[PDB]
Design a protein around this ligand. Structure first.
Ligand SMILES: [Mg+2]
Length: 1299
């Protein structure tokens, strides 16, 4: 290459400059590494490098073949020298000659390249290297190299007249190249290729002489010698293991490594599991004898009608067959007063002074119209009364730091959503649910009634708590003359009448549904402000509800008031029904596969409505797909529609329709229904153990039997990943690995163990039920298990293991406990281990995380990749195919990941990537999992002692019918199979990559031989994390009629994955689209060829969590962090502000806005002093509304107002009761620099935003495609079309240009 043209790319204007850091990743495919013969002698290093095999990529021409030498004086820096040989115009020009001398000590320092231009501009070029695989080091070395010369260069140039100097740095590794100097990609790829062969030789010769590494650390050396003496003196009694834990025999491992793989048995099976597939495509897609594409969609249409009628019938046969019912979906009455400031009649007067399932035909027409015409969004009159005036006061004060026109234009829109009536209704509910939750735990005198009058409103309550503290009974009454308006619907509860009063019927409410009634008024203002932007209206206009909006704010109001699972489930299951329809011609959409998961017993008048609307979406899709329209160079899809209420919309409007019931929680709800379910999902495949340990690691099979695998494959899918590691990194990857592990286990201290981690107090004592009762459990933390350890003289982690392994072998189990939150799907179960077992399991993680971290696909240890595989597939395919090449991908799933994996094959698949000293250890840390014992709640055991699977448990108890997973009398549940969730998180993801690299090498060898004997041309990519995956195949067909035969051929390859999986022990699911064209979907982000769609509504709903923190002003660093999550999810700068004002209303309502009798004081107090840590809410700036964090806002208020001078020196109750109980006139630029470190940078921002303070713009349309793009200032990524003045102008509202 050349070094002068490269310097001729950069242009500096005046003063000093650095540029912008840019990263090039390894994208293009390199060739094989050349033969290396290295011989170190007394004279020096003798090197022999052969001739690299040729590539069509044309890399490796730079390195020249032959024999050379390096002097032993310069062997310690071979890596820095061999790589940059060409750019090494070694002239050794000092800085004292070309620059002034100001006595800064840098005069002697000589950069590696100095280039002087004719005009006078100078470029300062550097060169560096790194050996780490973490992209933190690639930035660390760059930043320290910057600091190496930042100060003296400035000190010298400030004296200079007519100044122009640039600092240019390069950092190269085999991971990625980070540079601030523009290059072509190829010129970074060759740098990486050369670094490979440099480091390989440095390692090879490093072994012979110890003085070469004339460095390292005096302390680091101690750690390696500390953690090397353990793995040679540790000794677990083998013959005592094989007797205790059922299937652990050290002979099985010594036969896995040594015996080779049976190739005469592999090539036969792949030929029988193939013709299975091709004889199943033609049977279920109607390909024989021959039929036009128009006739086949007519056979498919009539098969989808049969299956749905046999489902509706069987659900009718067992049901109290009726066609009428008087009920209400909203158990609360419709009332709407004006905020101010028959034994039931006598009962009120006194204190004043089933189990059957409905039928799928029920005449649900009440609900069918409340969605079209409803009185929910008509502005009620009294938008100026007590409660709304008390909020207008606390919004002006916080918004005084800015006073521009954007603010008065966005605070007069929010004050228009707070006045509609669906919010004015929701404010007197969410105040009632703060009384019921308050007096939930209180005193009971048999026959007690408590009376309470709601403030702000003329409504009365009557509580009556029971001893269960899991129920409560109320009833409300009003004067019948104050009820002015009502909410105009027939889905409501019917109120008893009195001549002068109106009452209700003493209903009852649980106590898990009270965190959901308090977050009501805040999740409405977010659902009005999200669906008025997607449709097209603007915040500063007025309109009429366009009747595509009544249904979405109407439907959200119903699912969130009937709080049940199994009704928020027939919606989220509409995602795999509609996602079929993107499927390509040689196949047909088949959404009938979702029957099953759709046969449950209905129990309301809503789940009947959502079920009939869902089936007619299955019939319409099965009859025609979403059609393709390739107008521009881009592609578009036509015919999309909403699911529930048939409509027509675009993509983003559909993709967000899924995710209508999502919401998160962490409260660990307890109810006998929920807990009884978890134990059902744990013991499912326990009675299906094969009971003949010959196919669990000893031999081969063809037809596995639901827990088994074939060993001859696990050797052929491990040794196919090992090649792909040996080429990206250099050969001899093993020793270097051994170093990383040892230093990592050695230096781990006992003073830094993750505390606050819960553990389990389960032992022999808690084993018989009768004798242990009325005796609470109360599991404890981990901080106290570090106590008794330091009290015996142990400060290094690797010394507390030896006592922790014997404390298990003398017991015989794991002693686990259980814990479960309530959020309707996600990660709802948590498995807690005792303390003697977290120590033996900490070791097998650092041993197994350092091997994932050097793999190309796997995306859970190296997070950077998730993005860079699917975007960099276009370019890599274009280069070796030439434009005009199609894309045919898929996206998969696994059904039972845990509960389905034997715990061998996770110990055999790891012991292959290990250096033969640890084999005795890990094979003994695993095989601790083949006998477990899990607790069962006590309240669960009580009710059971005195229909499906519950009549089996109480049967297994009491000494009746024998079962294997439980025992008689004892309080626990045995098990002998399967990993658990979150315990073996990292070794199990390593077994996924050993598989996916078996396909990527199986498909590639199949494309190489065509069907007639030709050869297709293609490019195969694979990516996969813990459970998901994807595959992407691109081809280039020469002529027509070969585009038709080469697309039928691929369709099988992606289809036959379903049959080849059970040979490794993985079971494919029925939620895995197959053979889509131009669209893929990896984790939750859908890539529609050129448009990236990301579901926003998921992050808007999970934006106001009950803040469980002690000191105020530590809440606001959460609140202001659940905000930058949404903005990166794709949301305007004008909406992200209207989501902020809703956090405010939530905040002050926790300090007691409508619960406490004295709030004028705490309201009149904060107006005088506005500091946080007393309870003031610092608001953002209208534009740039979620970019800069909390600091920026604390600093933009630190230099304007009173804060300056002062700075010159249940769950709902205890969040409130801790809340209200705790209640020179400037700064010199030297102390501010101490406090706010970048206070010199913020002003580069604060001066730009004061240019756009006025509301003026137009309407445009541009580029119709979106792309993730990185912004730097803190770093935040904003979704936008392909600076700060440009982003702030485009992202204020879609289709609008500010200023
Ligand atoms: Mg998936």
């Amino acid at each position: 290459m050349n070094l002068e043209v490269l310097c001729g790319r950069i242009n500096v204007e005046n003063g000093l400059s650095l540029g912008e850091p840019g990263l090039y990743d390894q994208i293009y495919d390199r060739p094989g590494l050349p033969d290396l013969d290295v011989t170190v002698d007394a004279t020096g290093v003798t090197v022999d490098i052969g001739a690299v095999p040729d590539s069509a990529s044309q890399l490796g021409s730079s390195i020249n073949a032959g024999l050379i030498t390096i002097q032993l004086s310069e062997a310690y820096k071979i890596n820095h020298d061999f790589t940059f040989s060409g750019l090494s115009k070694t002239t050794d020009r000092r800085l004292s000659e070309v620059f002034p001398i100001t006595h800064d000590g840098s005069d002697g320092m000589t950069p590696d390249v100095i280039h002087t231009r004719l005009d006078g501009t100078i470029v300062v070029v550097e060169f560096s290297t790194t050996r780490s695989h973490n992209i933190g080091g690639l930035e660390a070395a760059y930043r320290t190299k910057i600091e190496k010369y930042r100060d003296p260069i400035s000190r010298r140039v400030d004296i200079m007249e007519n100044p122009r100097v640039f600092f240019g740095v390069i950092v190269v590794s085999s991971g990625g190249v980070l540079s601030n100097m523009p290059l072509t990609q190829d010129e970074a790829e060759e740098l990486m290729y050369r670094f490979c062969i440099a480091n390989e030789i440095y390692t090879k010769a490093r072994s012979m002489d110890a003085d070469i590494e004339l460095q390292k650390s005096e302390e680091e050396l101690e750690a390696i010698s500390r953690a090397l003496s353990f793995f040679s003196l540790f000794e677990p009694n083998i013959e005592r293991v094989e007797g205790t834990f059922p299937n652990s025999e050290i002979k099985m491992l010594e036969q896995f490594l040594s015996t080779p793989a049976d190739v005469d048995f592999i090539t036969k099976t792949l030929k029988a599991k193939e013709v299975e597939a091709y004889a199943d495509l033609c049977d279920s897609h109607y390909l024989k004898p021959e039929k036009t594409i128009q006739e086949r969609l007519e056979i498919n249409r009539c098969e989808a009608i049969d299956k749905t009628q046999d489902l509706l019938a069987g659900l009718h046969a067992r049901s109290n067959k009726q066609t009428s019912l008087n009920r209400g979906t909203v158990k609360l009455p419709p009332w709407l007063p004006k905020p101010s400031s028959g034994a039931y009649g006598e009962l009120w007067a006194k204190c004043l002074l089933s189990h059957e399932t409905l039928s799928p035909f029920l005449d649900v027409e009440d609900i069918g119209d409340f969605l079209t015409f409803n009185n929910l969004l008509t502005d009620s009159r009294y938008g100026d009364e007590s409660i709304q005036r008390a909020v207008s006061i606390l919004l002006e004060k916080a918004s005084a730091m800015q006073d521009t026109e954007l603010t008065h234009a966005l605070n007069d829109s929010f004050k228009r959503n707070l006045s509609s009536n669906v919010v004015q209704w929701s404010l007197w509910v969410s105040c009632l649910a703060q009384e019921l939750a308050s007096a939930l735990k209180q005193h009971c005198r048999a026959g007690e009634f408590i009376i309470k009058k709601l403030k702000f409103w003329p409504i009365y309550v009557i509580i009556k708590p029971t001893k269960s503290s899991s129920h409560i009974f109320y009833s409300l009454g009003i004067r019948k003359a104050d009820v002015t308006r009502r909410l105009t619907g027939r889905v409501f509860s019917d109120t008893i009448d009195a001549g002068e009063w109106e009452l209700t019927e003493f209903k009852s409410l649980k106590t898990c549904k009270l965190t959901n009634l308090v977050n009501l008024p805040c999740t409405m203002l977010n659902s009005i402000a999200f669906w008025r932007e997607k449709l097209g209206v603007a915040p500063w206009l007025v309109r009429k509800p366009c009747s595509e909006l009544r249904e979405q704010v109407g439907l959200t109001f119903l699912i969130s008031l009937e709080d049940k699972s199994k009704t928020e489930e027939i919606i989220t299951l509409t995602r795999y029904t509609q996602m079929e329809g993107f499927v390509s011609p040689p196949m047909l959409p088949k959404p009938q596969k979702m029957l099953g998961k759709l046969d449950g017993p209905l129990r309301t008048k809503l789940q009947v409505y959502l079920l009939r609307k869902h089936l007619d979406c299955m019939v319409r899709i099965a009859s025609q797909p979403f059609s393709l329209i390739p107008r521009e160079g881009r592609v578009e899809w036509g015919g999309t529609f909403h699911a529930i209420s048939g409509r027509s919309t675009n993509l983003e409007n559909m993709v967000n329709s899924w995710y209508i019931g999502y919401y998160k929680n962490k409260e660990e709800s307890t109810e006998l229904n929920a807990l009884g379910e978890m134990y059902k999902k744990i013991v499912e495949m326990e009675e299906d153990k094969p009971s003949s340990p010959e196919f669990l690691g000893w031999g081969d099979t063809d037809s596995p039997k639901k827990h088994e695998f074939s060993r001859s494959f696990l050797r052929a899918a491990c040794s196919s990943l090992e090649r792909e590691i040996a080429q990206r990194h250099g050969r001899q990857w093993k020793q270097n690995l051994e170093e990383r592990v040892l230093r990592e286990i050695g230096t781990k201290n006992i003073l830094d163990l993750a505390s606050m981690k819960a553990t389990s107090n389960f032992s022999k004592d808690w084993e018989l039920y009768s004798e242990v009762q009325t005796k609470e459990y109360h599991r404890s933390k981990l901080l106290e298990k570090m106590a008794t350890l330091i009290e015996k003289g142990v400060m290094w982690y690797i010394d507390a293991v030896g006592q922790a392994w014997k404390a298990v072998l003398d017991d015989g189990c794991m002693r686990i406990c259980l814990f479960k939150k309530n959020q309707h799907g996600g990660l709802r179960e948590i498995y807690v281990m005792d303390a003697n077992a977290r120590l033996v399991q900490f070791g097998v993680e650092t041993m197994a995380r350092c091997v994932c971290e050097l793999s190309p696909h796997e995306t859970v240890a190296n997070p950077r990749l998730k993005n860079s595989i699917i975007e960099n597939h276009g370019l890599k395919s274009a280069r070796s195919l030439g434009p005009g090449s199609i894309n045919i991908n898929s996206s998969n799933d696994a059904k039972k990941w845990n509960q389905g994996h034997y715990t061998t094959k996770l110990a055999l698949v790891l012991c292959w990537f290990m250096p033969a000293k640890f084999h005795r250890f890990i094979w003994a840390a695993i095989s601790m999992f083949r006998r477990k014992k899990m607790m069962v709640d006590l309240r669960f055991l009580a009710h059971l002692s005195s229909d499906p699977f519950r009549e089996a448990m109480t049967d297994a108890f009491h000494g009746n019918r024998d079962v294997s997973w439980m025992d008689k009398g004892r309080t626990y549940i045995k098990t002998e199979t399967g990993m658990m969730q979150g315990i073996l998180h990292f070794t199990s993801s390593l077994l996924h990559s050993c598989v996916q690299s078996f396909y990527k090498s199986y498909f590639v060898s199949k494309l190489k031989e065509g069907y007639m004997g030709e050869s297709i041309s293609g490019v195969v990519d694979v990516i996969e994390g813990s459970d998901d995956s994807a595959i992407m195949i691109s081809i280039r067909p020469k002529s027509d009629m070969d585009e038709v035969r080469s697309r039928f051929f691929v369709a099988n390859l992606l289809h036959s994955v379903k049959f080849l999986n059970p040979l490794f022990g993985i079971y494919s699911s029925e939620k895995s689209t197959v053979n889509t064209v131009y669209c893929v979907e990896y984790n939750s982000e859908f890539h529609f060829h050129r448009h990236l769609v990301r579901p926003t509504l998921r992050w808007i709903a999970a934006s106001h969590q009950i803040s469980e923190t002690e000191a105020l002003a530590s809440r606001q660093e959460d609140y202001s962090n659940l905000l930058t999550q949404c903005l990166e999810g794709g949301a305007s700068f004008s909406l992200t502000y209207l989501i902020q004002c809703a956090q405010l209303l939530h905040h002050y309502m926790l300090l007691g806005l409508c619960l406490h009798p004295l709030f004028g004081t705490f309201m009149g107090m904060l107006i005088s002093d506005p500091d946080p840590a007393l309870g003031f809410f610092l608001m953002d700036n209208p534009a740039f509304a979620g970019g800069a964090g909390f600091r920026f806002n604390l600093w933009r208020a630190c230099k304007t107002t009173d804060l300056g001078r002062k700075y010159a020196y249940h769950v709902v109750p205890r969040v409130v009761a801790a809340g209200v109980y705790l209640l020179g006139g400037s700064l010199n630029p030297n102390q501010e620099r101490m406090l706010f470190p970048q206070a010199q940078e913020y002003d580069r921002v604060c001066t730009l935003l004061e240019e756009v303070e006025h509301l003026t713009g137009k309407f445009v349309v541009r580029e119709r495609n979106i792309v993730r793009s990185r912004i730097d200032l803190r770093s935040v990524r904003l979704l936008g079309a392909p600076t700060i003045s440009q982003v702030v102008r485009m992202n204020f509202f879609p289709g609008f240009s500010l200023e």
